[PDB]
Design a protein around this ligand. Sequence first.
Ligand SMILES: O=C1N[C@H]2NC(=O)N[C@H]2N1
Ligand SMILES: O=C1N[C@H]2NC(=O)N[C@H]2N1
Ligand SMILES: O=C1N[C@H]2NC(=O)N[C@H]2N1
Ligand SMILES: O=C1N[C@H]2NC(=O)N[C@H]2N1
Lengths: 123, 121, 123, 121
Amino acid sequence: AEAGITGTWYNQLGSTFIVTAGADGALTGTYESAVGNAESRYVLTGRYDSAPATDGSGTALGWTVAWKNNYRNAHSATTWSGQYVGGAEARINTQWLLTSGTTEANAWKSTLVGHDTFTKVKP
Amino acid sequence: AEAGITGTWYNQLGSTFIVTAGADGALTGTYESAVGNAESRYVLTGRYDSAPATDGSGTALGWTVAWKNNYRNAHSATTWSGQYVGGAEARINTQWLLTSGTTEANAWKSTLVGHDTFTKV
Amino acid sequence: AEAGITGTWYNQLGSTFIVTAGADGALTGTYESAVGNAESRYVLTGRYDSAPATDGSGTALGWTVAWKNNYRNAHSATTWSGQYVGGAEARINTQWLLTSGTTEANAWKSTLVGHDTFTKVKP
Amino acid sequence: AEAGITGTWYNQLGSTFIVTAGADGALTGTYESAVGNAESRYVLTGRYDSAPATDGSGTALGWTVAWKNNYRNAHSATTWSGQYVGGAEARINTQWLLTSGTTEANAWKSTLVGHDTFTKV
Ligand SMILES: O=C1N[C@H]2NC(=O)N[C@H]2N1
Ligand SMILES: O=C1N[C@H]2NC(=O)N[C@H]2N1
Ligand SMILES: O=C1N[C@H]2NC(=O)N[C@H]2N1
Ligand SMILES: O=C1N[C@H]2NC(=O)N[C@H]2N1
């Protein structure tokens, strides 16, 4: 549902995710990370299932943040893949992949994987 | 390098990725998978890091595809995270996460992980 | 530390992990999963850093369970990679990969990824 | 097929994996990586699923290597999860997780993920 996803969310590290879900399945917003070589806000773009199932299934969605803005350029990008589960305590549970740009030689260790849980605060 | 991300790419499964990379870091285009609960094209959106480093590093990027279009709704979304490397033979090396929308009971097994390599051949 | 890892542990799904850490960095035991095409106990084998660092760093370790025993054969195997963090509330935080045996054609979707947190109960 | 997992395998990075597959599902041997904070051989232990299915499916298996030996202690461990496919050209296709022991502050970035393909060539 777009309304349910739209809002301000935070995760366990203390990062901020501000998103708007558009009618066509699009997600746009900004992300502020509490950790890493990151400062200020970054632009994020993603997609979500605008037509989930009836039932108590989560809504699959994903988004990307390239870690470059006017203040910093970390030469990396993160993609979060997960599902939104609404209710009185709406959560977005995800797993993410953080890839850094590297030389052909260190490419084997260019990607980090983790998981984040976001709790909604505002629309 | 970077702008050269624009084009038509294909991966080892035969899927087609058509992207336009905008000067400021955006990625837009369509994706058509050769496998899965999918038919036709799906819209994709992503970001790439528009000012890569001397050093001969690749350009980090990622994009998402929600597997819903006017033909099918597979109730899942895939994100690809990787890097672009240009040169005579340019490729985009990625690892992806495909999450399906499940009930809680099946949440533990909602995500598949894989890797795709794209070239313009 | 072997003593700290040795014991009975459970995770958020309600699965049981019984392990013994040997002096040489080896881990042996049994695993009982609360979910999946799994029944009874399965044998597990792994390795851990028998010489972690001083400091408050976790001990890296990993183990594998092939999901076949005398009662069931799910044609799959899971590997858990994570770190043991001791203290009064010792935990083992992990990320896992569950690969199923498939045809060359469905190989693209042979692996599931997730994360489990284990809480210790007994030695 | 299965028993044929025993042997010396090499991956695209040039690492060498020497394994012995026991009749009841065990995997034992040594690993020597061509990259990283590693030198010489490390002990590995794993499991494979000893009764694979007609159907022409691969044999699921996984193994672990703690990067500590009498030369180095990199305070990390890697697990490879994948499947073995035999035939004229046999390979083991895997995805791995490399976890380092961090302080809590760095726990979020303690795990790398990759994929390796091994052959006996
Ligand atoms: O909120 C954050 N989650 C983690 N993933 C990532 O890429 N950077 C970290 N910050
Ligand atoms: O091209 C594809 N890559 C794989 N990942 C995914 O999500 N579907 C498959 N198609
Ligand atoms: O305890 C469990 N964790 C999950 N990972 C896995 O492979 N099966 C599930 N059971
Ligand atoms: O052969 C190797 N594979 C890669 N994964 C890993 O842990 N170290 C590297 N060496």
